[PDB]
């Protein structure tokens, strides 16, 4: 066995409380290097006859990435205290992996050798709002969804969908237009809406905020926003707004004061200023979002700033009853602020979903004291590389999915915001080079994956476009221009997801087929039901062997409803080019 | 390249801010497997400025443990933001290590593959009080230091130091006794005193608290405590008290109420009770420290309990100006409480040192939002196994020290509470089998090691005893029963530590000798200042070669003060059994 590939450390994704009485422990080792692994565990103070009392529990291999095998075990400490280790077996070789290193047999003269999970506290438990787990989100960029009130449209607004958008063009989309098209979303099966910024700002995207306490006049007023939220609630749709707390806009009052009065302004500490007076040339002498002068970075360490943003955060919840806050550039704002943010938000309305925009590994923000989840862009990356660009094999895709999922605790993955694109990415149909068959596969995977998926407006009807701003075209309402095949496909999958719990909250496992290149086979299971998905990611028909025992095993096609029994101990599934099939499994 | 042994993840000991402008990045690889490592780095938004290529910085190997090599690099992001990857060079091939995996060359496209350190926030920076770095602590168990007030000694106190202590014996030690012997401590060189529990409790150790707002009558009164602290402060000695917040005592009023009234008690939720009425056996029906009935666990999640404990924490600081809080069984209290604890204590007195009693890996409590340090028992175990028990080689000792040190960020190690024993361990002289020569080596290593070391009362004069209660004998004040040589050795070493910054704040590196079984050679470095230490851990004379080069190099024997020029390529030093020598290395 290779000791250099064995790893565990008491925190993050390797050791965490799943609930008030249960702990989850993981261990990773070199793939196929270990035959069996057992968790050695016991209460730190449980002694009898002068010997430490501990037991052995076999661990299950939950999956593996390109380099490692991941092992899992759940344990309910008798007194909520635990000292543990790992015993690995390979042939006649045995290793005991502990915090103090490796041993060849279990040392029991003391507990100091072992890893420790001191005490399971309910207060430190990671707990996201349960309702998001069954939710399917729909992201809307307000300036481009629907012009429901022409009288408030920006002057210079272009005819709807008359031309591709630019960084400064306006088409007159507003909040009323969203209200007017809610039945379209209900029919689709959407139960959650995520809106990009809607507070006063001069731009079409509004990430350069002028006033966080005012709805942009071009989008509507507070009365209209309230009606929108109330109407969504009546129809069973939760609403999440965009919080741009990392930076403000050039027209933000406090910034204007500092821009004019420099170091004597009482708002100078509200920002990250390097020298006075402020300037934008040759470059800004203050921190900004990226290198954008009109987006001054806010000092969230300043008491007055924190008070203001926390007031903003609770105001919209208290007065408008929103259901979530999507945090713009969340990773660039300090942890101290995010902890206070959670405390005040959750104290007001525990149901509010706290979603951070972080495109990379976000474990530091997912320990339970800050966010409920992050926009899962790493998932986006992997799914697009396999289904859209076909850059990696099915084997490599499974490895990447196993890699990212095992990088986090199970309860964290259960609340993950799994998207395929957004206002900050190219359109999936375009990433797919215009092949609807590939887009159908993207939706199939997304909608059968555990978590809280989000659909970018227009992707369900085949809208096209490159990256920002090309991906922000006016929503296509003309039924003659909407791709009917895709819309029906999405509606169908969302319905299925709502009907099968394993798709929404189950564990995922990948089965290795003969052709580990184009055939993807995976299962979703929650202990009560099991759904098998088989995908032929190739332009040729395929006969794919399904690795499952045929003893008393019955399958039910979820799309056609057809029931049939297996027998060949490995039934053969025949699929047309880019075809796919889903089966509910029955063991009688 | 063994990909399975390579590792980095943007947090804890692998990625952190060292100061407001500097980031530290670490990478671990299979020992001797990698020849060189380069850090590819840049600002995440460099692309906006047309800067698509990374900057490159070579990483330095800071040490190796049993299985890995550790690489290091410090970076000052121009805009406090960083995106990075690693380039590893091996005879086999060159590989780029990123968050998305390994690549043979730096990806030429614009996809996000890299690790990220979003923003360097001063507010999230780990920062312990600077003064602790130059402090040498002395731990005192009040019931056994000195009987300065016979009139308040417990009834039935045994003649001072006349017999071995027991779990229930009393000798009459008190706070006045400490005051009476301050000059002894000043002479020794001590600049910090850590006292075990001193609040009212029926026991001789007092970890079963009866009243947190009262100094035990047998130890003295609030007036005596003030005198002690003021005299200490006048002598440049800081004072740290023991906070027993995980559990209270059997005589704690709130608990007595619950034990009497049961479920009808208004204090029922102040503890962890499973059933009523409360029972103490076979095992308590309520959570306790270990299974001690007289030590019921407090519910630090209960608002009243938190307020009471926080009031306690701030009371002694505000009223008596203490300089630190040592947290008893700190790992068994929730993180939420520790965050509030830090906020309140630091707001009151930023200089207060927060030390948690955690014997295992404490990374989760050392990210900057909770403790400043923990009692470094893992250091204690490693040092004892080498110098005292001689159960491991000099090579294995070097590996273990590198292992535990690289497990934490540099600024965390710089404030670490490095002890060799305490009231919860056997006496070091006894662990050394009565060999004073070995104890001298223990003090030598401890006092030349970076951090905030602590000396257990009596160890500086050779007191003996097994583990609790044996290690709690009355302090020996008669010089005829004190080991003068050892005492002067400790006094001399504390003097040197104060004179050479590299000993208390420098980096450490182990130089591997030919006979790396008994010969230990290491150096402390801080800028150009270097202290070389050579230890002969064997019971026979030895001639050990000093690897150092003579290139305009001069050595200063820190024990004798003797100066001399370096011979040729390697100077040889003759040492007696368990001998040692320290040399300041000057580069001219
Ligand atoms: Ca309009
Ligand atoms: Ca006394
Ligand atoms: Cl309405």
The full 3-state SS of A113-150, as one line of letters, equals CCEEECCCCHHHCCCCCHHHHHCCEEEECHHHCCCCCH
Q: Which CATH class is domain A1-125?
A: mainly beta
Q: Which residues pair with B543 in a beta bridge?
A: B574
Q: CB burial class (10 A; 0-12, 13-18, 19+) of residue B551?
A: exposed
- Using DSSP's 3-state secondary structure scheme, residue B120 falls into coil
Alpha-carbon gap, residue B406 to B64, rounded angstroms: 9
Residue from A244, A336, A331, A344 nearest A292 by CA: A244
Query: Cis bond leading into A282, ω under 30°?
Result: yes
Alpha-carbon gap, residue B453 to B462, rounded angstroms: 18
The label of the residue with tokens 């009935």 reads: B293
Contact A403, A65 (CB under 8 A): yes
C-alpha of residue A200 to centroid of ligand 1, in Å: 15
Domain boundaries, chain A: 1-125, 126-245+300-505, 246-299, 506-588
Residue from A362, A457, A465 nearest A404 by CA: A362
Contact A306, A300 (CB under 8 A): yes
- Using DSSP's 3-state secondary structure scheme, residue A450 falls into coil
Mark out the alpha helices in B235-287 (DSSP H runs).
Answer: 253-261
- B147 labeled binding residue: yes
Buried b (16+ CB within 10 A) or exposed e, B307-337: ebbbebbbebbeebbbbbbbbbbbbbbbbbb
Contact B252, B211 (CB under 8 A): yes
Q: CB burial class (10 A; 0-12, 13-18, 19+) of residue A515?
A: middle
Residue from B500, B567, B569, B579 nearest B536 by CA: B579
End-to-end CA distance of chain B, in Å? Answer: 41
- Using DSSP's 3-state secondary structure scheme, residue B97 falls into strand
The label of the residue with tokens 């798709």 reads: A503
Q: Give the list of residues 6+ apart from residue A221 with CB closer than 8 angstroms, or none.
A: A215
Contact B87, B55 (CB under 8 A): no
Radius of gyration of chain A (CA): 26
Q: What residues have their beta carbon closer than 5 A to ion ligand 3?
A: A 227, 231
Chain B residues in contact with A467 (beta carbon < 8 A)? none
- B518 labeled binding residue: no
DSSP secondary structure string for all residues of B366-415: -SSSS-SEEB-HHHHHHHIIIIIS--S-HHHHHHHHHHHHHTS-HHHHTT
Domain A1-125 identical in fold to domain A506-588: yes
Number of CB atoms found within 10 A of residue A462's CB? 20
* Token pair for A204: 């079409």
Radius of gyration of chain B (CA): 26
User: Who among A2, A11, A67 is closest to B363 (CB)?
Assistant: A11
CA torsion A24→A30→A34→A38, rounded to 10°? -20
Buried b (16+ CB within 10 A) or exposed e, B488-510: ebbeebbebbeebbbbbbbbbbb
Buried b (16+ CB within 10 A) or exposed e, A27-54: bbbbbebbeebbbbbbbbbbeeeeebeb
User: Which ligand has its closest atom nearest to the C-alpha of A218?
Assistant: 1
User: Who among B5, B123, B290 is closest to A301 (CB)?
Assistant: B123
DSSP secondary structure string for all residues of B509-562: EEEPPTTTTTEEEEEEEETTEEEEEEEE-SSS-EEEEE----TTEEEEETTT--
C-alpha of residue A148 to centroid of ligand 3, in Å: 12
* Main-chain dihedrals φ then ψ at residue A487, nearest 5 degrees: -60, -40
Q: Give the list of residues 6+ apart from residue A405 with CB closer than 8 angstroms, or none.
A: A63, A413, A508
The DSSP symbol for A105 reads: S
Are B4 and A67 in contact (CB < 8 Å)?
yes
Q: CB burial class (10 A; 0-12, 13-18, 19+) of residue B586?
A: middle
* Token pair for A191: 């139960």
Right CATH for A246-299 from 3.30.70.20, 1.10.3720.10, 3.90.400.10, 3.90.230.10: 3.90.400.10
Contact A154, A211 (CB under 8 A): no
For residue A311, the surrounding DSSP H or E stretch is helix A303-320
For residue B586, the surrounding DSSP H or E stretch is strand B580-587
- A326 labeled binding residue: yes
Task: Please state, in angstroms and as integers, the Cα–Cα distance from residue A404 to each residue in A30, A309, A382, A448, A450, following that order.
Answer: 17, 32, 9, 17, 13
Q: Give the list of residues 6+ apart from residue A154 with CB closer than 8 angstroms, or none.
A: A170, A172, A204, A218
Q: Which residues pair with B218 in a beta bridge?
A: none
Å between B570 CA and nearest CA of chain A: 35
Chain B residue whose CA is closest to A9:
B361
User: Which ligand has its closest atom nearest to the C-alpha of B178?
Assistant: 2
Instruction: Give the count of alpha carbons within 13 A of A17, CB side only.
Output: 20
The structure was resolved experimentally with X-ray
Q: CB burial class (10 A; 0-12, 13-18, 19+) of residue A516?
A: middle
For residue B175, the surrounding DSSP H or E stretch is helix B175-180
Å between B549 CA and nearest CA of chain A: 35
Alpha-carbon gap, residue A17 to A367, rounded angstroms: 11
Q: What angle do CA B394, B398, B402 make, to 5 degrees?
A: 170
Q: Give the list of residues 6+ apart from residue A519 with CB closer than 8 angstroms, or none.
A: A394, A513, A534, A535, A536, A537, A538, A542, A544
3-state secondary structure string across A335-369: HHHHHHHHHHHHHHCCCCEEEECCCCCCHHHCCCC
- Pairing state of beta strands A199-200 and A115-117? unpaired
C-alpha of residue A396 to centroid of ligand 3, in Å: 48
Which CATH superfamily is A506-588 part of?
Golgi alpha-mannosidase II (2.60.40.1180)
Q: Which CATH class is domain B126-245+300-505?
A: alpha beta
Task: Please state, in angstroms and as integers, the Cα–Cα distance from residue A393 to each residue in A93, A442, A537, following that order.
Answer: 35, 15, 10
DSSP secondary structure string for all residues of A487-533: HHHHHHHHHHHHH-HHHHH-EEEEE--S-TTTEEEEEEE-SS-EEEE
Backbone conformation region of residue B290, classed left if phi is above 0, alpha if psi is from -120 to 50, else beta: left
* Token pair for B93: 């091939």
Q: CB burial class (10 A; 0-12, 13-18, 19+) of residue A525?
A: middle
* Main-chain dihedrals φ then ψ at residue A244, nearest 5 degrees: -100, 75
Contact B403, B385 (CB under 8 A): no
For residue A274, the surrounding DSSP H or E stretch is none
Chain A residue whose CA is closest to B16:
A364
Alpha-carbon gap, residue B281 to B291, rounded angstroms: 9
Alpha-carbon gap, residue B287 to B300, rounded angstroms: 13
Residue from B378, B533, B519, B509 nearest B447 by CA: B533
Alpha-carbon gap, residue A498 to A504, rounded angstroms: 8
Contact A329, A246 (CB under 8 A): yes
Task: Please state, in angstroms and as integers, the Cα–Cα distance from residue A196 to each residue in A288, A472, B129, following that order.
Answer: 20, 12, 43
Are B4 and A363 in contact (CB < 8 Å)?
no
The label of the residue with tokens 């020569």 reads: B437
* Main-chain dihedrals φ then ψ at residue A439, nearest 5 degrees: -65, -35
C-alpha of residue B179 to centroid of ligand 2, in Å: 12
- Pairing state of beta strands B542-546 and B571-575? antiparallel
Alpha-carbon gap, residue A219 to A198, rounded angstroms: 7
The DSSP symbol for B271 reads: B
Alpha-carbon gap, residue B146 to B6, rounded angstroms: 54
- Pairing state of beta strands A60-64 and B115-117? unpaired
* Token pair for A556: 């039910």
């Amino acid at each position: 066995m290779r000791k250099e590939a064995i790893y565990h450390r008491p925190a993050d994704n390797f050791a965490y409380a799943y609930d008030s009485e249960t702990l989850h422990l993981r261990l990773r080792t070199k793939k196929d290097d270990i035959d069996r692994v057992e968790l050695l565990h016991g209460d730190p103070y449980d002694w009898q006859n002068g010997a430490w009392q501990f037991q052995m529990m076999p661990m299950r291999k939950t999956g593996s990435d390109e380099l490692f095998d991941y092992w899992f075990a759940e344990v309910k400490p008798p007194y909520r205290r635990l000292r543990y280790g790992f015993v690995l077996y390979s042939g006649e070789e045995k290793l005991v992996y502990t915090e103090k290193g490796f041993y060849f047999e279990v040392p029991t003269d003391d507990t100091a050798y072992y890893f420790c999970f001191p005490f399971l506290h309910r207060v430190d438990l990671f707990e996201a709002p349960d309702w998001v787990k069954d939710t399917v989100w729909y992201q809307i960029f307000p300036e481009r969804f629907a012009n429901g009130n022409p009288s408030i449209s920006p002057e210079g607004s272009r005819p709807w969908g008359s031309e591709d958008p630019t960084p400064t063009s306006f088409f007159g989309g507003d909040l009323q237009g969203i209200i007017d098209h809610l039945d379209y979303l209900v029919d689709l099966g959407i139960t959650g809406i995520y809106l990009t910024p809607i507070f006063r700002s001069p731009s079409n995207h509004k990430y350069d905020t002028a006033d966080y306490f005012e709805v942009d006049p071009h989008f509507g007023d507070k009365e209209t926003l309230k009606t929108l939220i109330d109407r969504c609630h009546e129809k069973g749709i939760r609403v999440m707004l965009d919080a741009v707390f990392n930076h403000c806009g050039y027209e933000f009052a406090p910034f204007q004061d500092v821009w004019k009065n420099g170091e004597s302004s009482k708002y100078k500490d509200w920002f990250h200023i390097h020298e006075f007076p402020l300037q934008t040339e040759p470059r800004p002498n203050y921190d900004t979002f990226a290198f954008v002068p009109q987006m001054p970075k806010l000092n969230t360490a300043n008491p007055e700033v924190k008070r203001y943003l926390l007031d903003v955060a609770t105001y919209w919840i208290r007065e408008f009853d929103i259901d979530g806050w999507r945090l713009d550039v969340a990773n660039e704002i300090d942890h101290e602020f995010w902890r206070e943010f959670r405390q005040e938000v959750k104290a007001l309305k525990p149901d509010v979903y706290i979603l951070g925009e972080i495109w990379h590994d976000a474990m530091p923000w997912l320990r339970g004291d800050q966010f409920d989840a992050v926009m899962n862009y790493p998932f986006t990356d992997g799914v697009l590389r396999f289904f859209a660009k076909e850059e990696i094999s099915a084997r490599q895709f499974a490895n990447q999915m196993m890699h990212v999922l095992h990088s986090y605790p199970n309860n964290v993955n259960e609340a993950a915001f799994n998207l395929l694109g957004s206002h900050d990415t190219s359109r999936i149909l375009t990433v797919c080079g215009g092949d609807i068959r590939k887009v159908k596969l993207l939706f199939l995977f997304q909608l059968t994956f555990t978590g809280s998926p989000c659909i970018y407006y227009g992707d369900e009807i085949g809208m096209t476009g490159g990256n920002d701003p090309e991906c922000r075209k006016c929503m296509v309402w003309d039924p003659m221009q909407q791709n009917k095949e895709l819309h029906q496909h999405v509606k169908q999958l969302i319905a299925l997801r709502k009907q099968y719990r394993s798709l929404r909250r189950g564990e995922i496992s990948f089965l290795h087929a003969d052709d580990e290149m184009n055939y993807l086979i995976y299962k979703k299971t929650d202990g009560d039901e099991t759904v098998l998905v088989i995908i032929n990611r190739s332009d040729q028909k395929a006969d794919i062997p399904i690795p499952l025992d045929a003893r008393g095993t019955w399958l039910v096609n979820l799309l056609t409803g057809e029931r049939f029994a297996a027998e060949a101990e490995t039934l053969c599934t025949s699929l047309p080019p880019y075809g796919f099939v889903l089966y509910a499994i029955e063991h009688w």
